[PDB]
């Protein structure tokens, strides 16, 4: 189960999703303090 869950393709998807997530969080707070 874990060998299927943490496969390289799923790993790269997790990483890209988390990157865009942290990006949008910090960008939203940047534009929210900019109000």
């Amino acid at each position: 189960f874990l060998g299927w869950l943490l496969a390289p393709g799923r790993l790269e998807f997790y990483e890209k999703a988390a990157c865009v997530a942290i990006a949008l969080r910090v960008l939203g707070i940047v534009i929210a303090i900019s109000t």
């Binding site: 943490l6 790993l11 997790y14 990483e15 990157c19």
Partner: protein
């Protein structure tokens, strides 16, 4: 980023933190020894190779470093120990010729049992 690097660091940090908390749990319940700290002092001192004792004396008499000159002093000690161990691996030790290397890596000799007791 790069979960493949994060997971080993995550588990390493977990177990090392647990080790620290266990050390704290053991130093408060059972307070530290006052003088056997010298026992462990000298018994971690004894296994320091000879190529480092040259700075140990240099560590005693003032002229150690500022903080940076030692951190480039013990580097070459590490490296000469490294190459010495490489030569002990390949060409053997100082009192040991190729026949004895073949003896040791073929596991031909048993540990001395008569001399044990």
């Amino acid at each position: 980023p790069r979960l493949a690097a994060v997971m080993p660091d995550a588990v390493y940090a977990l177990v090392q933190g647990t080790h620290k908390l266990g050390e704290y749990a053991h130093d408060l319940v059972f307070p530290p020894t006052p003088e056997d700290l010298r026992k462990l002092e000298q018994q971690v001192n004894a296994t320091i190779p000879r190529e480092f004792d040259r700075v140990r004396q240099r560590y005693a008499e003032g002229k150690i470093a500022n903080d940076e000159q030692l951190s480039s002093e013990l580097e070459d000690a590490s490296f000469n120990w490294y190459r010495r161990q490489l030569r002990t691996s390949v060409v053997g030790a100082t009192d040991e010729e190729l026949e004895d290397v073949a003896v040791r890596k073929l596991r031909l000799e048993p540990p001395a049992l008569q001399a044990s007791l």
